Amino acid sequence: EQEEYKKEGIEWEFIDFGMDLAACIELIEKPMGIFSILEEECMFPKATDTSFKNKLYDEHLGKSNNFQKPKPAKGKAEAHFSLVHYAGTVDYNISGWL
Amino acid sequence: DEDETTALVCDNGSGLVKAGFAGDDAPRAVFPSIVGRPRHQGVMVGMGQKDSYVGDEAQSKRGILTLKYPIEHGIITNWDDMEKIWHHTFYNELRVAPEEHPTLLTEAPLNPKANREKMTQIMFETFNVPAMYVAIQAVLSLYASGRTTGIVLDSGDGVTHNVPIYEGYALPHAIMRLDLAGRDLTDYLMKILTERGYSFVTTAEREIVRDIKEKLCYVALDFENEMATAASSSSLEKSYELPDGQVITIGNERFRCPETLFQPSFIGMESAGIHETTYNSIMKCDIDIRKDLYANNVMSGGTTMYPGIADRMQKEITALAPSTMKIKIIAPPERKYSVWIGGSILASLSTFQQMWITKQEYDEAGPSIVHR
Amino acid sequence: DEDETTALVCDNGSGLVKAGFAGDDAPRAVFPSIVGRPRHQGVMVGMGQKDSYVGDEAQSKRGILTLKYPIEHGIITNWDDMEKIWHHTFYNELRVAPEEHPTLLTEAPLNPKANREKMTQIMFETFNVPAMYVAIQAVLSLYASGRTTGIVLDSGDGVTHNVPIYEGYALPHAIMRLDLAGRDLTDYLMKILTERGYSFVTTAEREIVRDIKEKLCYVALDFENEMATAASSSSLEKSYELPDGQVITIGNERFRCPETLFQPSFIGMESAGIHETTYNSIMKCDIDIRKDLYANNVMSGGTTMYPGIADRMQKEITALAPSTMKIKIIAPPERKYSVWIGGSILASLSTFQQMWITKQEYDEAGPSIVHR
Question: Where N6,N6,N6-trimethyllysine occurs along the chain (chain A)?
Answer without folding.
Answer: 53
